[PDB]
């Protein structure tokens, strides 16, 4: 069973930002036409070549070996912003150790005079701010006027980010991760905590209106190209980390045992965990909309702080809220820290496979972990400042889960389906597993996933809406250009590798292409 800060954090706010009900139709369309086949595809590439990352494509069409470098750039940017998520979770954890939680009431220093408590909001009869949103935007974020105003580096959040990078650095190497009975604890503790939030959320007054927001689709919103890419790349986001889950928690361990059915087990458990966490979150948001005087779609942040608003707000409606706040943010830290151990281990493994003996493995290699974590911390300092949410939402929308994931998935499916061969790949699959994949996987890699990714990419490129944080901020064109630069640094790995592999190999164009598309 796989779970991370995908299901728990990302899917609720991407669903809430895109109207709730209208998000689930592209979510399940991508889940059953793209996401499970692409997840099985990358798992078969991982099990096929007995190496890691970039050099997994020397046996699958070495012309397109830039998919490995695209995965390198995607996981690097993902590590930076996913660890600043963990910095926010740590900051909420250290603010959870007093008796009465700081987001429960608004009489503190960071609160505006316009606030009053959410319990006393329907007795006013309306431009009154909730205390959870005020705490989130003014003590955790200390949200500035825009990305043009980064303000000052929050030393609280920067030391929380340094603490969680020291936890990562002291566990990636010079240490060991969870192996034995602690695995059995950390496999069911996030599910138990999510079950506690779900049972709490459904019993809140007004959860039914939130579930009606969550499940009933708004069909006019399906014509928004933001919804389709948000859903499909939430699938590709939650499964690229699930790709690293199998690869980093055991390579070729599932060798004869059904890496088809293993992949559908973890994929369906991951998507079901997303769906359960969405039920919990939107039950809380329906409760908050009934409790306040505002709409369900306006009650909280249409942006990444939804899990830091709805889940702490539900924690404040528990018996002993300090207990549930401490354990919920410990759960967030365990989930994202295990996923960060997974992704940083994958990044180190793939870079020391990029240079097997070239200057990395022959030296100490302890210092390479420190340098990678150091520049990843310094890049994480750009989005943990006072304008840190704007840089963070840029990184989340663009750097590792935007059209870049559609680009990588379409290019993997196109290469394996056409330039490598569905039948050749199926023969390899039968060699490792024992049976060729069915017409679902075959026609998904051939037709369905390239058509879905190309259609969503072209559909947003013809019906473009800019990235907006919390429906009210409009990013400046330099910030949109920076986000597209992160996406293209993930995306332009493939064509630049195509060009340099054409120019390094001597011969005519047909001979170069023929040499580079035949596997080695």
């Amino acid at each position, epitope marked *: 069973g796989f779970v991370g800060l995908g299901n728990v954090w990302r899917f609720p706010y991407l669903c809430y930002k895109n109207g709730g009900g209208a998000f689930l139709i592209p979510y399940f369309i991508f889940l059953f036409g793209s996401g499970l086949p692409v997840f099985f595809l990358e798992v078969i590439i991982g099990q096929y070549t007995s190496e890691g990352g970039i050099t997994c494509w020397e046996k699958i069409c070495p012309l397109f070996s830039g998919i490995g470098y695209a995965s390198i750039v995607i996981v690097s940017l993902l590590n930076v912003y996913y660890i600043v998520i963990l910095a926010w979770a740590t900051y909420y954890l250290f603010h959870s150790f007093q008796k009465d939680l700081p987001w429960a009431h608004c009489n503190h220093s960071w609160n505006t005079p316009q606030c009053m408590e959410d319990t006393l909001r329907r007795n006013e009869s309306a431009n009154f701010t909730s205390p959870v949103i005020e705490f989130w935007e003014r003590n955790v974020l200390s949200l500035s006027s825009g990305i043009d105003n980064p303000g000052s580096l929050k030393w609280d959040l920067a030391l929380c980010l340094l603490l969680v990078w020291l936890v990562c650095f002291f566990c990636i190497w010079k240490g060991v991760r969870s192996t034995g009975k602690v695995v059995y604890f950390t496999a069911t503790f996030p599910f138990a905590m999510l079950l506690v939030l779900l049972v709490r959320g459904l019993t809140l007054p007004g959860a039914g209106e939130g579930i009606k927001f969550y499940l009933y689709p708004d069909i006019s919103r399906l014509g928004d190209p933001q919804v389709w890419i948000d859903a499909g790349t939430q699938i590709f986001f939650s499964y690229a980390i699930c790709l690293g889950a199998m690869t980093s928690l055991g390579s070729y361990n599932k060798y004869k045992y059904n890496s088809y059915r293993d992949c559908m087990l973890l994929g369906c458990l991951n998507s079901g965990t997303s769906f359960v966490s969405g039920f919990a979150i939107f039950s809380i948001l329906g409760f908050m909309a009934q409790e306040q005087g505002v709409d369900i779609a306006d009650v909280a942040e249409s942006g990444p702080g939804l899990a830091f608003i709805a889940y702490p707000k539900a924690v404040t409606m528990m018996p002993l809220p300090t207990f549930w706040s401490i354990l919920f943010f410990i759960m967030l830290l365990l989930l994202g820290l295990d996923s960060q151990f997974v992704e940083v281990e994958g990044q180190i493994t793939s870079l020391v496979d990029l240079y097997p003996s070239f200057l990395r493995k022959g030296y100490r290699r302890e210092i390479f972990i420190a340098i990678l974590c150091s520049i990843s911390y310094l890049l994480g300092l750009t989005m943990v400042t006072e304008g840190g949410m704007y840089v963070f939402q840029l990184f989340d929308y663009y750097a590792a889960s935007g059209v870049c994931l559609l680009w990588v998935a379409f290019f993997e499916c196109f290469v394996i389906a056409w330039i490598y061969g569905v039948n050749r790949f199926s*023969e*390899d699959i*039968r060699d490792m597993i*024992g*049976y*060729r994949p069915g017409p679902w996987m075959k026609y998904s890699w051939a037709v369905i996933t390239p058509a879905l990714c190309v259609g969503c990419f072209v559909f947003s490129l013809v019906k473009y809406v800019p990235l907006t944080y919390n429906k009210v901020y409009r990013y400046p064109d330099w910030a949109i250009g920076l986000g597209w630069g992160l996406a293209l640094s993930s995306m332009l790995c493939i064509p630049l590798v195509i060009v340099i592999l054409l120019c390094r190999t001597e011969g005519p164009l047909r001979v170069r292409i023929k040499y580079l598309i035949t596997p080695r």
Partner: antibody, heavy 118, light 108 residues
Framework: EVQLVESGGGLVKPGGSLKLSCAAS????????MSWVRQSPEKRLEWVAE????????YYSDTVTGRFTISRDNARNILHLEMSSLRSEDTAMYYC????????????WGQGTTLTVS | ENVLTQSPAIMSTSPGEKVTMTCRAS???????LHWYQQKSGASPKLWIY???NLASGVPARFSGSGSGTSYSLTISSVEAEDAATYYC?????????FGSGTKLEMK
């Protein structure tokens, strides 16, 4: 109806060679891996050689690893088995078997060709 | 090789009697890869039970299979005159694919 017909079996000298030909029809031959299973006159079954769906993954048993070669012609839907250095403990009744899914076994077999070494 | 020592070949059982036959493997088979074949007198083998429990097409429900790992069993609920044949158990996981020995069911 899936049918597998084997041919090219007969008496050969020891240390010689003979070419079997499993001809199959009624199904697509490029999508199913194929194996050769022999049966001794003492009536024990021994798997000889499996070729994959495209011929890129070829396996042999420990008895005939270095002297038996199995080949497929996808175009003519025929499965072959080139032999070499046929020793005395190789007289058998050679069957062609459609083994593609590893969890469903050899679901369709064929007739036999009596390879006789004397 | 993964030598599958099977039950002794000469078993003689009266019709209508519940019978069983074992298939011990030297290595460990993954229990989705061990199959049973029924070869009649002078005829070709045919797939009879696959993945140690499932029934092949044209096989009556009176046949059943059980076991996992090392010990695998074929069970007939009641024997009729069309059940007089030799049964071979066969792992198909490890790349030197091996069949079992004989288990020839003769009448009385």
């Amino acid at each position: 109806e899936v049918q597998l017909v084997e041919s090219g079996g007969g008496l050969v000298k020891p240390g010689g060679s003979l070419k079997l030909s499993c001809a199959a029809s009624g199904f697509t031959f490029s999508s199913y891996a194929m194996s050769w299973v022999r049966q001794s006159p003492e009536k024990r079954l021994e798997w000889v050689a499996e070729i994959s769906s495209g011929g890129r993954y070829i396996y042999y048993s420990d008895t005939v690893t270095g002297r038996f070669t199995i080949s497929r012609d996808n175009a003519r839907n025929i499965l072959h088995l080139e032999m070499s250095s046929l020793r005395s403990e190789d007289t058998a009744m050679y069957y062609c078997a459609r083994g593609e899914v590893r969890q469903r076994g050899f679901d369709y077999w064929g007739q036999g060709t009596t390879l006789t070494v004397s | 090789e993964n030598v599958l020592t099977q039950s002794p070949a000469i078993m003689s059982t009266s019709p209508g009697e519940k019978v069983t036959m074992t298939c011990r493997a030297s290595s460990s088979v993954g229990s989705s890869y061990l199959h049973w074949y029924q070869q009649k007198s002078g005829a070709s083998p045919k797939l009879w039970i696959y993945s140690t429990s499932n029934l092949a097409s044209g096989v009556p429900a009176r046949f059943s299979g059980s076991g996992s790992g090392t010990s695998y069993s074929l069970t007939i609920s009641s024997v009729e005159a069309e059940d007089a044949a030799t049964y071979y158990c066969q792992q198909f996981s490890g790349y030197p694919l091996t069949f079992g020995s004989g288990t020839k069911l003769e009448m009385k």
